[PDB]
Design a protein around this ligand. Structure first.
Ligand SMILES: Ic1ccc2[nH]ncc2c1
Ligand SMILES: Ic1ccc2[nH]ncc2c1
Lengths: 546, 546
């Protein structure tokens, strides 16, 4: 009975296999058949390539030895290689051309999701080439999805030597009959079979996945489109910056490249961006996913004025100052989307680019009090319910699990009217005491939000809505400005509060505005449509954020 | 009696002044004298430039209005500007050419060091130009050194309006006679004088600094070369990554660009790099200054095996994995320098470049036990004293203040023999109970190390020396390798343990090795010679680390 799956790298998790490309080179070069593949394999266990794979020597040391094998193979062949022949060029090009076999990785992902222990077992080298980062990046992306990565050059043993298979078994804490072993090399597959392991010879991926599906009894082929990679909170780098004597800001950080500062809405967390963080880091960006002031591990002072846009924006500037960042791309959702527009208007020199999910940019009306403005729109009634200190805190804090379960739902499954909230006397007045679980979230994810909110509750978060007059007075100073830095407005078709139509006049104030639109998407954009959000943000970032 | 100093930005803290460059442009272009300076100043308080400086409009909105003023000034002048005339080009070029007036900043730094409250008061704009980052970076570098930064476009008032001076006074919490105000503009200087503030009209810096020195009674001109910027621990971004169930690694993070991972030695801290962190971040790098395992806020498990090089290196790889970093430049000192060479040998794909201060790279002798090797050199006797669990912990933990004060000393002032340590029965056996303070450190800095070491003591740190056999066996597997990635060896002339001569054969194993050498430098390289360390590292990083 299987509980472990082992995958080779070359020709299994990454395509294409070496022997094929060495073959391709022989042909492109009109060289005698198999000469390159032959010099590569020269001396077998005692040869230069085995020493490389065992970690005795580096890739740069192996290059001249492979060169010497090529000449000697050519000498016996009664052949002469040209004067433009480079092993370095051939190998640089081949390593660079090799990409993750996405459907193979998906099957490994599904197996692990079903409780399998997964591992990569590979005959690899110690790469010290000037271009080593390309391979480093590939191994980084691949390895995160597996329980174990066993590299021949690290353990000093190679396939097909029996000890590596015994090493693999000892690592897995499994007896061989509990293991599926996938390899594209028949010779490297035999020792695993000898031990009684289930083996799959990998030629074309589809056939290999059909065999894998049959042996495991788990659907791997033709499955629905998977969700993007999420975040395990305990596996993240957690950062903390004191922005002022009583205020510290917490954030989760992943990746390298231009800083992308993610600003959640109400009543959320850095964790609301769980589906965006790995994708954006994988796309070549340094992600800083904030716990906004009043939330999670960030400070939550009680004073209402601590949460006006002017103070919040000033603190975000100090946050960048303390981190040594002259700029960051600012991406916000809901209340975070509002902050992000104000960061663009007031601190454009610190904003590389600005993007908002659902939250439109609407200039302050200097001829109408913000309270009058909110009253004009029936859907903003919940904002009035939030005004009175203590009222919404008591309802929202009564049962945290009910709060997040009632709030976090797709457009298809709501239990909340958002209609005449004050008149009804609550957000959850006609809501079940034990709401069902939305298709959007797992119980574990609800529990994370529950645990986060146990620290400071809803006072600081609700305070974000309690500065309408102060925010209005400050926003009025920006009335003659326009947003001329790169900007993206992302609307959600089924957000019944932050309706797409509310963003319709944005081009009057952001003339070069770029747009994204998500169909059949509710208010909780990031978890509702993670794949689409990722696609829109990465595409916009690569074209406009540099 | 003075206690506050205020500096203008344009023509005071940054050079050169606008009126001069607008003048320069008129001349280069053969334009009627003062036309550009005139169109710039058009409409005075009611004009386009005042609105820009008050924050009513952005720089990109102001450009076409300045263009329209230029034409109208030319029309009256009976002049026609050419068809290649660009306000954007002129202003982009001028902003870019403007640099920090280093001697003015030094005087502001000295005044603040002497207890003055310092501030920058500037008539500036909201920059939304594609090239805004150049200015953002300059303001970031400048602002960190001051108590206050008052920007006209942020406060909605400009010099020479009296309210800005009253705003400045209210910010300073000072009466005008307590303030020196430096400005290059006579008109902007008068309101401050009217209030009774001490004023300095700034033309050439030297004369301005002579006047400043006279009025304050503090030496600002001809002073000794200052130390590089240090770190205030409470003002840093603190990061935490769990590398395994029982191990968490703490680090301080500053800057943007390629990741540079700083690895301290024994018995140190991330704080040992305090003089390097701001400089390296300012040089265009993302600094990650570690608390190595066993130190400060990082975990300190008791087991000896937790501190062998193999485990330490594996954890540093996981640290990069968890942060989403495919590579980092690794810079180490003492025990950190040793780890950094092993990172290069075992994980070259993860090492962008490698640099070591004092610690040479010496391949393991497979024919001699590491204990035999250590015994062969009299200076390594302290390492034998460190072998026995509990002995060195008791002496080093008896009085923390005495420990760091006795250890952290320049080559000129040592109290420690490091000679026949075991025979003497201790490191501090012939050392004063109340050591004097080294010229290298302040009492506050000693206290920081004291506080850090109160958490875990010396067990985990001393454990770094307790894996000689394990490290030797592992290092022997790398005997056929060479270091072919970019590498720097920095020797310290007066390090009497890690003597420069010990690094003499390094080129045999690192053929492309680059070098640095610091004269009159002891063991505590970073704090002994911070300016020289910074110069060597930045120069090497820019040429070899990208
Ligand atoms: I609180 C909150 C805010 C906006 C919303 N839009 N749709 C649901 C919903 C809940
Ligand atoms: I602990 C230690 C290690 C090396 C040294 N070199 N010079 C002083 C000194 C102290």
């Amino acid at each position: 009975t299987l509980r472990a799956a082992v995958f080779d790298l070359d020709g299994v998790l990454a395509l294409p296999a070496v022997f094929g490309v060495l073959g391709r080179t022989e042909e492109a070069l009109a060289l005698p058949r198999g000469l390159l593949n032959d010099a590569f394999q020269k001396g077998g266990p005692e040869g230069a390539t085995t020493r490389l794979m065992k970690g005795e020597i580096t890739l740069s040391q192996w290059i001249p030895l492979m060169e010497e094998n090529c000449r000697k193979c050519s000498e016996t062949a009664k052949v002469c290689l040209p004067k433009n022949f480079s092993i370095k060029e051939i190998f640089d090009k081949a390593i660079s051309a090799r990409k993750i076999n996405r459907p193979m990785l998906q099957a490994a992902l599904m197996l692990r999701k079903k409780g399998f222990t997964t591992a990569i077992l590979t005959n690899t080298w110690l790469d010290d080439r000037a271009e080593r980062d390309g391979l480093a990046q590939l191994m980084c992306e691949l390895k995160m999805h597996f329980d174990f990565l066993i590299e021949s050059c690290q353990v000093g043993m190679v396939k097909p030597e029996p000890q590596i298979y015994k090493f693999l078994l000892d690592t897995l804490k499994a007896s061989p009959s509990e293991v599926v072993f996938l390899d594209d090399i028949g010779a490297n597959l035999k020792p695993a079979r000898d031990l009684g392991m289930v083996t799959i010879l990998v030629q074309d991926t589809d056939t290999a996945l059909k065999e894998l599906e049959k042996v495991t009894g788990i659907q791997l082929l033709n499955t629905p489109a998977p969700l993007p990679t999420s975040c395990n909170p305990s596996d993240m780098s957690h950062g903390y910056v004191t922005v002022k004597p009583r205020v510290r800001l917490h954030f989760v950080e992943l990746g390298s490249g231009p800083a992308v500062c993610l600003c959640h809405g109400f009543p959320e967390s850095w964790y609301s961006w769980r589906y965006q963080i790995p994708a954006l880091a994988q796309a070549g960006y340094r992600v800083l996913a904030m716990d906004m002031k009043g939330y999670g591990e960030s400070s939550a002072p009680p004073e209402i004025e601590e949460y006006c846009m002017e103070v919040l924006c000033k603190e975000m500037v100090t946050f960048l100052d303390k981190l040594g960042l002259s700029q960051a791309v600012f991406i916000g959702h809901d209340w975070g989307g509002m902050l992000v527009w104000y960061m663009a208007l007031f601190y454009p020199e610190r904003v590389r680019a600005v993007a908002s999910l659902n939250t439109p940019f609407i200039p302050a009306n200097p001829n109408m009090s913000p309270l009058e403005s909110i009253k004009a729109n029936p859907v903003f009634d919940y904002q009035l319910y939030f005004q009175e200190p203590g009222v919404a805190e008591a309802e929202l804090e009564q049962n945290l699990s009910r709060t997040f379960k009632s709030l976090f739902r797709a457009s298809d499954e709501s239990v909340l009217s958002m209609h005449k909230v004050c008149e009804a006397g609550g957000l959850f007045v006609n809501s079940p005491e034990e709401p069902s679980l939305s298709r959007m979230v797992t119980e574990e994810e609800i529990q994370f939000y529950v645990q986060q909110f146990k620290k400071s509750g809803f006072r600081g978060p609700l305070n974000w809505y309690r500065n309408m007059e102060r925010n209005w007075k400050w926003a009025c100073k920006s009335l003659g400005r326009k947003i001329l830095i790169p900007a993206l407005m992302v609307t959600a078709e089924k957000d019944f509060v932050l309706v797409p139509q509310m963003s319709q006049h944005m081009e009057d104030w952001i003339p070069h505005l770029k747009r994204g639109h998500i169909e059949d998407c509710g208010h909780w954009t990031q978890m509702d449509k993670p794949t689409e959000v990722n696609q829109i943000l990465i595409k916009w970032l690569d074209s406009d954020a540099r």
